[PDB]
Amino acid sequence: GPYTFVQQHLMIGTDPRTILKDLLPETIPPPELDDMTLWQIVINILSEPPKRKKRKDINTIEDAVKLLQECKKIIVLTGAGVSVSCGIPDFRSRDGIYARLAVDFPDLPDPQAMFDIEYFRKDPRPFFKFAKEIYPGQFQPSLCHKFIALSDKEGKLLRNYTQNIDTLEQVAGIQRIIQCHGSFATASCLICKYKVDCEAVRGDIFNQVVPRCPRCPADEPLAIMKPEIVFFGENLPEQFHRAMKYDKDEVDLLIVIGSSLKVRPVALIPSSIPHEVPQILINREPLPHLHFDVELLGDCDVIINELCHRLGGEYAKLCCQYLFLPPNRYIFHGA
Amino acid sequence: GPYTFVQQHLMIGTDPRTILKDLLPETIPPPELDDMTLWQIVINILSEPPKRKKRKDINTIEDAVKLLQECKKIIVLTGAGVSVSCGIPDFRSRDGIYARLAVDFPDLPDPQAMFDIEYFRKDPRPFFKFAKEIYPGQFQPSLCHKFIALSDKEGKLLRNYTQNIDTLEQVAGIQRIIQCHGSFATASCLICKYKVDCEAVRGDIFNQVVPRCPRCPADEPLAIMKPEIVFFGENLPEQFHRAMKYDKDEVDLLIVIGSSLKVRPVALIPSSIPHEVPQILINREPLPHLHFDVELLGDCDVIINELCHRLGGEYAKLCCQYLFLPPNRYIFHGA
Numbered sequence A, B: 001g002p003y004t005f006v007q008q009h010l011m012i013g014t015d016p017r018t019i020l021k022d023l024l025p026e027t028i029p030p031p032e033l034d035d036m037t038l039w040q041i042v043i044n045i046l047s048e049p050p051k052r053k054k055r056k057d058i059n060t061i062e063d064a065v066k067l068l069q070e071c072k073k074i075i076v077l078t079g080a081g082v083s084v085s086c087g088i089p090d091f092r093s094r095d096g097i098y099a100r101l102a103v104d105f106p107d108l109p110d111p112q113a114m115f116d117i118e119y120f121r122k123d124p125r126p127f128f129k130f131a132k133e134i135y136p137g138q139f140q141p142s143l144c145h146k147f148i149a150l151s152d153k154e155g156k157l158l159r160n161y162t163q164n165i166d167t168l169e170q171v172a173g174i175q176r177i178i179q180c181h182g183s184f185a186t187a188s189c190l191i192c193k194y195k196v197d198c199e200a201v202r203g204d205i206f207n208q209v210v211p212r213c214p215r216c217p218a219d220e221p222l223a224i225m226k227p228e229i230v231f232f233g234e235n236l237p238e239q240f241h242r243a244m245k246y247d248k249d250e251v252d253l254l255i256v257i258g259s260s261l262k263v264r265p266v267a268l269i270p271s272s273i274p275h276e277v278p279q280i281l282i283n284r285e286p287l288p289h290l291h292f293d294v295e296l297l298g299d300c301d302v303i304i305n306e307l308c309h310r311l312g313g314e315y316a317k318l319c320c321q322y323l324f325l326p327p328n329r330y331i332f333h334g335a
């Protein structure tokens, strides 16, 4: 029911054009279109039946833990949601950086400029102020991170595709990781591409000083050490495609945790795997554009805590009240 | 999707017990039940498939005006919604009388006491203060009223079952009317049941003086002229049943305008007629417990205005921009 989604955004006063930024990436709709028209376009896209239909023999949280404890070769997709409890708000939320743009980053014109290679070459001052906010060694991994880490110890994790750049998966000790939009783990020079570790550059950044390449000529200004995050203008990591090529025909369980799935390439994964592969959702809010077999709604940690409790054994040792909506929705604390 | 309904009420902090007042009338759930349990009961009831399923060959507003201009023998159900534009808020809304109870009616214990025969016999002072607020000859009928009036002139109206007591249907000139919860049209004495017209008692009420029976002994206190509104403790008008007995097998089109359909006996009508009879909804908000073939959402007058415009002819002379949600929902101004 895309009604709820549209009505919700109609009273809030959302620009439908920015919604279409997600629904139609790599397409700029003409500026002559009025907002009443843009909204009907939005609706027309969401109301289209999804590629991958829901498996009807899979519905309950009981079904979910069964699949969890039985399945090897699991794929987990994680977004900004798994880190909010750690102290990092979604960039797109009200206490996030995009909404804080005029407050703390008046130099930046767009939210896009924060991760635009063309702006960064012009002026990297605002990126490194932000980098100090979410720098490794300031936040502890959430229960979700540790959960994923445990599944990897247990040999169940085919891959964790994460959208996060906070490198918490690193800290949590998750091995089989794929960071789609890169991470703060390393930093390369724009010029000579000399690579280095994050814990090194930490000091330079924590003291508001821009890291430059120790090997380049100091005359060079573009000699800057940039954390290997995928900026606008830059290509995706080629390992994503190499990983996804194999994974799609070996995955037997897909778990989406704490992601809106608004942003490619991760957003494409649920409809790029075999339709008989069970898909489970763990999120604060349901998704309008995709159908999942089991939908667990609320605080991601709260939900993982329940499953960990249910799975018992090793998973229970991680532990620090729902409503059932037939046939496959659950409401936990959170919305 | 009863999810939207439940989540909406969970953040607002609604007592699920008062929801169950509607979902389970004539059943008082035991007081030992905690609210988490009461909510799952609510969900369990709403998630039950409705008696009358939706006709799939009927979906659009084009389908709606076709049915409207083709059908004779039409049944229209109207609730508090058709009168809000006239100046009478829903009793259950924030500017309504139930929420104004502590402000303007501190004598009243319950909202129920306002229309409880046992309280009225104790103390009719608060009922007549309220009666002066919504008394006939203070509000003009809405576009919806006039619309229904026109359908009745045209011979299309089998019946208008209204929940309203404001008697605006009277003012609008609607003939084939059934006032399920009674109306201010007449007033009878509790004792001798001597009947009288409203425009008479107007003066007594407008001057905060209680009307008493001119024929009873003045010694009698219960000699009071009460507007023949159906109070708690009293039976429904027997004409409702007499009307519904015939109507259910002669109705070919059912229109619900401006009603939540929370309250019996009108709430029962959509599931008490043949399932092949097309049902159309005109309301500010969709209904969780019932399925309609076409759902027109927004300000009731705004919607009727569109249909009147479309129907042309006589209906257009009543006239004083939507979004389509496939396959059968429309969003107008209002929510």
Ligand SMILES: C[C@H]1CN(C)c2ccc(-c3cccc(C(F)(F)F)c3)nc2N1C(=O)Nc1cccc(-c2cnco2)c1
Pocket (backbone or CB within 6 Å): A024, A027, A028, A029, A030, A037, A040, A041, A044, A045, A048
């Ligand atoms: C409201 C209808 C008819 N109207 C309202 C339109 C008027 C204009 C456009 C339109 C024109 C130029 C460019 C675009 C653009 F796609 F947004 F770039 C849209 N699209 C639509 N409409 C669309 O449905 N457009 C549209 C555009 C792109 C994708 C889809 C679509 C709908 N379901 C799957 O894909 C639909």
Ligand SMILES: C[C@H]1CN(C)c2ccc(-c3cccc(C(F)(F)F)c3)nc2N1C(=O)Nc1cccc(-c2cnco2)c1
Pocket (backbone or CB within 6 Å): B024, B027, B028, B029, B030, B037, B040, B041, B044, B045, B048
């Ligand atoms: C949560 C389940 C099991 N639990 C949670 C319950 C625990 C207690 C009750 C219950 C006990 C006594 C009285 C009532 C009362 F019906 F509310 F009065 C409910 N009902 C339910 N439950 C119900 O589903 N109760 C219930 C009560 C009345 C109607 C329905 C129903 C569900 N679908 C159509 O009707 C369901």
Ligand SMILES: CS(=O)(=O)NCCC1CCN(c2ncnc3cc(C(N)=O)sc23)CC1
Pocket (backbone or CB within 6 Å): A079, A080, A083, A088, A089, A090, A091, A092, A115, A163, A164, A165, A166, A167, A181, A229, A230, A231, A232, A233
């Ligand atoms: C979109 S791109 O390919 O050009 N790369 C540009 C940068 C992206 C980084 C990932 N994105 C996020 N967006 C919103 N919230 C969050 C919270 C995060 C966290 N705790 O790590 S990352 C994140 C998007 C931008």
Ligand SMILES: CS(=O)(=O)NCCC1CCN(c2ncnc3cc(C(N)=O)sc23)CC1
Pocket (backbone or CB within 6 Å): B079, B080, B083, B088, B089, B090, B091, B092, B115, B163, B164, B165, B166, B167, B181, B229, B230, B231, B232, B233
């Ligand atoms: C429920 S009953 O059988 O015992 N009869 C008691 C009184 C009912 C009268 C009808 N009800 C309403 N409820 C909420 N809003 C409104 C707005 C109205 C209007 N403009 O006339 S009537 C109304 C309910 C109570």
Ligand SMILES: [Zn+2]
Pocket (backbone or CB within 6 Å): A189, A190, A191, A192, A193, A194, A213, A214, A215, A216, A223, A224
């Ligand atoms: Zn260099």
Ligand SMILES: [Zn+2]
Pocket (backbone or CB within 6 Å): B189, B190, B191, B192, B193, B194, B213, B214, B215, B216, B223, B224
């Ligand atoms: Zn009398």
